[PDB]
From a paper:
Here, we have determined the crystal structure of the antigen binding fragment (Fab) of anti-SCH antibody JoJ48C11, both in the apo form and in complex with the oligosaccharide laminarihexaose. The JoJ48C11 Fab fragment adopts the expected heterodimeric structure of a heavy chain fragment and a light chain both consisting of a constant (C) and a variable (V) immunoglobulin (Ig) domain. The Ig domains show the typical immunoglobulin fold characterized by two anti-parallel β-sheets packed against each other. The model is consistent with experimental data and validates our previous hypothesis about the specificity of JoJ48C11 towards SCH and other similar β-(1,6)-branched β-(1,3)-D-glucans, namely that the β-(1,6)-bound D-glucose residues in conjunction with the triple-helical structure constitute the binding epitope for the antibody JoJ48C11.
For this, we produced recombinant Fab fragments of JoJ48C11 by adding human constant CH1 and Ckappa domains to the respective variable regions of the initial JoJ48C11 scFv fragment and crystallized the purified protein to collect diffraction data. The resulting structure was refined to 3.0 Å resolution. Not surprisingly, backbone atoms can easily be superposed onto other Fab structures, and even several structures with almost identical CL, CH and VL domains including their CDRs can be found. However, with respect to previously published Fab fragments, the VH domain of JoJ48C11 Fab is slightly different, especially in the CDR3 region. To further refine insight into the JoJ48C11 Fab/SCH interaction, we used SwissDock to generate models of a complex with the repeating unit (RU) of SCH and the apo structure of JoJ48C11 Fab. Two similar docking poses positioning the RU inside the typical antigen binding area of antibodies were identified. Subsequent mutagenesis studies proved His35H, Trp47H, Trp100H and Trp90L to be necessary for binding SCH, since their respective alanine mutants showed significant decrease of binding strength with EC50 values of 1.1 nM to 10.9 nM, which are higher than 0.6 nM (3 times the EC50 value of wild type JoJ48C11 scFv-Fc). Interestingly, in order to avoid clashes with SCH, Trp100H has to adopt a different sidechain rotamer than is observed the apo structure. Here, we discovered via protein crystallography and in silico docking that the paratope structure of JoJ48C11 consists of two cavity-shaped binding sites that are connected by a shallow groove.
Author numbering:
A (entry chain A): 1 to 131, 138 to 217
B (entry chain B): 1 to 210
């Protein structure tokens, strides 16, 4: 019943500002403080601050005092955090969560922030051609920023699929592979197509893989 | 400003085993809280006030500790308990979290199926060559992949990526990508992917000729 719908992922330029939202449903917005926590890979979780949506009172971790600004709109049951003077250190996942008082064990799904001066770039998609079990796949190369979405035969091919985590190239652009394992007898019969979807560049590409 | 150090950083456990992870606070702490995070989801409250379980948490979990050492325990490890566990304190503000303890599943060794892929002609048109080597459904994660071009051991021109542990059979997969320029690719003829792993008695080599 309780759902915390956070804003979509954002890409921001260095020194710019970004505002992310956190919509509350299923519980009384004013009765619970809204905390904000930061997750960088490798570092762990950092506590940013809280707001009391009834009174608007805020406290901040001294680390984030000047970075973050917390606001809340009782009318829409929505909490806000604004990051300013963005650096690459501010690239992280920011969670929104009523940790106090107790009784709402759920967090928001998380907004991913990327701080880069670079423009978006769509992926190039190359096949990994096969040739009683043959492997085949798709190489999704040279995109920015994250993430990329790979599905197979529009969705009807879920079993045996391995979409690997993105790996950062020396070019500064991400790359990943998506692989599927299938019987080799069905190679000439079944047609295998991977559906690559890169949202920040509004790019959809479908690539047929054949021996 | 209390720094929570969780030990161990990585651990594995067989289903049935008892699991214990600690959280050591740089200063005294009244209560410790524990959150659970599974891959690609947000954290969830798991234990509050040191010992008290959250709503939904199975009884196999339990929490103890005082002063500078707190503990999270699972009496009978289960498959669904594989996740990352963070400890937290409010006692002294600012609130601080732990670095996490990752709980993976144990399993018998499994050898990888190895595949090698030559670069597509569409890619060579772009002037670059990616040679991909795929290791499928193996355990443990520790595997050594080496590229050898005309018996020359490559170095510094390849990247690996590893999947999360499979929820079903607890195996891993890995893709090593050997990136060359189209010029360098065509200088040499034989491309080889040499996998070493405990599930193999001897290293498996997949190769092709240009």
């Amino acid at each position: 019943e309780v759902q915390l719908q956070q804003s979509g992922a954002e890409l921001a330029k260095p020194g710019a500002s970004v505002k992310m939202s956190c919509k509350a449903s299923g519980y009384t917005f004013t009765s619970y403080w809204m905390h904000w926590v930061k997750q960088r890979p490798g570092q762990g979780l950092e506590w940013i601050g809280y707001i009391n949506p009834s009174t608007g009172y805020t406290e901040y971790n001294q680390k984030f005092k000047d970075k973050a600004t917390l606001t809340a709109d009782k009318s829409s049951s929505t909490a806000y955090m604004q990051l300013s003077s963005l650096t690459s250190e501010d690239s992280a996942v920011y969670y929104c969560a009523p940790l106090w008082p107790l009784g709402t064990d759920y967090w928001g799904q998380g907004t991913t922030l990327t701080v880069s001066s670079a423009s978006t770039k769509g992926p190039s998609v190359f096949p990994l051609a096969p040739s009683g079990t043959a492997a085949l796949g798709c190489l999704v190369k040279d995109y920015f920023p994250e993430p990329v979405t790979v599905s197979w035969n529009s969705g009807a091919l879920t079993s045996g699929v391995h979409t690997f985590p993105a790996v950062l190239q020396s070019s500064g652009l991400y790359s990943l592979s998506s692989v599927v394992t299938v019987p080799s007898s069905s190679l000439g019969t079944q047609t295998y197509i991977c559906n690559v979807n890169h949202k920040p560049s509004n790019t959809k590409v479908d690539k047929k893989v054949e021996p | 400003d209390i720094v929570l150090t969780q030990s161990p950083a990585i651990m594995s456990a067989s289903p049935g085993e008892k699991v214990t992870m600690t959280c050591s606070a740089s200063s005294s702490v009244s209560y410790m809280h524990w959150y659970q995070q599974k891959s690609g989801t947000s954290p969830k409250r798991w234990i509050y006030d040191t010992s008290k379980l959250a709503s939904g948490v199975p009884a196999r979990f339990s929490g103890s500790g005082s002063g500078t050492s707190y503990s999270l325990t699972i009496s009978s490890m289960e498959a669904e308990d594989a996740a990352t566990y963070y400890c937290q304190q409010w006692s002294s503000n600012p609130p601080t979290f732990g670095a996490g303890t990752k709980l993976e599943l144990k399993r018998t060794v499994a050898a990888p199926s190895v595949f090698i892929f030559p670069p597509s002609d569409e890619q060579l048109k772009s002037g670059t060559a990616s040679v991909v080597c795929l290791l499928n459904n193996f355990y443990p994660r520790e595997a050594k992949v080496q590229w050898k071009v005309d018996n020359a051991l490559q170095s510094g021109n390849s990247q690996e990526s590893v999947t999360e542990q499979d929820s079903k059979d607890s195996t891993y997969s890995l893709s090593s990508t050997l990136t060359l320029s189209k010029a360098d690719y065509e200088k040499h003829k034989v491309y080889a992917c040499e996998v070493t792993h405990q599930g193999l008695r001897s290293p498996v080599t997949k190769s092709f000729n240009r």
